[PDB]
Amino acid sequence: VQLVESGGGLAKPGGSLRLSCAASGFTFSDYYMDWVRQAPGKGLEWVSRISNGGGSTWYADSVKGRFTISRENAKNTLYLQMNSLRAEDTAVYYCARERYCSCYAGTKYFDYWGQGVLVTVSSASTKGPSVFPLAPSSRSTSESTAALGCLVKDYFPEPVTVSWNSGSLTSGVHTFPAVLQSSGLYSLSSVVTVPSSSLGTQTYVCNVNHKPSNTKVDKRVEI
């Protein structure tokens, strides 16, 4: 049972975006589906509801007239069309399956959720990051542990994905939430703590992916 979303990103005010939720592992045509929304730092807000057949829709007041929930059962795909986007539409969007049942007659709770895709409404321009190595000062390399880093600097559209050595280095990773500087741009950083001995045994490259700008960089960090 998988709900995989796609189609987020940056959109200018008054613009449009379309979200997709591909489902697998269940009879998609048997379940009601829903879109739920979560503004950054705020709570959950229901957005839209679609029946299993697709002929019955429901929208929240903040969204009536601008969004359209769709469903393609031949390809198990749930759609959320978003037109006349406002700044208040900036949020993380989730799809959610509604359980099947046939006074508690309809239990109807949300059984499975998607991973969430961030939509950002803004007049600002997309800006890809500069990726810089954060190398230690050669004094921690003569200690028992050393800290390597990547600086993902000055990217406007959130989010940015950071991995280390193609996902093969996960133990001892700190990827820090982004700072929003007064220029309107974001910056984040990631550090791996390793044993200093490991500095002579493997290399270190961070995988930085900023999809809104099509910026995928694998940065080697040498000491």
Partner 1 sequence: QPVLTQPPSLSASPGASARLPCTLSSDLSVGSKNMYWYQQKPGSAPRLFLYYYSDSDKQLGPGVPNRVSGSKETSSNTAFLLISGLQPEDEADYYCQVYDSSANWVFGGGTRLTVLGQPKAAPSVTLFPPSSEELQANKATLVCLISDFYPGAVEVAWKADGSAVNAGVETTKPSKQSNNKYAASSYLSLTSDQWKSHKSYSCQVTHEGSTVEKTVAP
66 interacts with partner 1 by CB under 8 A: no
Contact partners, residue 194, CB within 8 Å, separation at least 6: 145, 146, 147, 148, 172, 204
Site map for partner 1, 69-98, x if CB under 8 A?
-------------------------x----
161 interacts with partner 1 by CB under 8 A: no
Using the contact rule CB under 8 A, the part of the chain among 63-71, 72-80, 130-138, 203-211 near partner 1 is 130-138
113 interacts with partner 1 by CB under 8 A: yes
187 interacts with partner 1 by CB under 8 A: yes
- 3-state SS, 28-81, equals HHHCEEEEEEECCCCCEEEEEEECCCCCCEEECCCCCCCEEEEEECCCCEEEEE
22 interacts with partner 1 by CB under 8 A: no
209 interacts with partner 1 by CB under 8 A: no
The residue within the footprint of partner 1, chosen from 108, 195, 202, 218 (CB under 8 A), is: 108
Please state, in angstroms and as integers, the Cα–Cα distance from residue 213 to each residue in 135, 160, 222, following that order: 26, 10, 26
158 interacts with partner 1 by CB under 8 A: no
Please state, in angstroms and as integers, the Cα–Cα distance from residue 68 to each residue in 35, 73, 84, 207, 222, following that order: 11, 16, 12, 36, 50
Q: Which spans of this chain sit near partner 1 (rule: CB under 8 A)?
A: 34, 36, 43-46, 49, 58, 60, 94, 103-104, 106-111, 113-116, 130, 132-135, 137, 147, 149, 151, 153, 174, 176-182, 187-189, 191
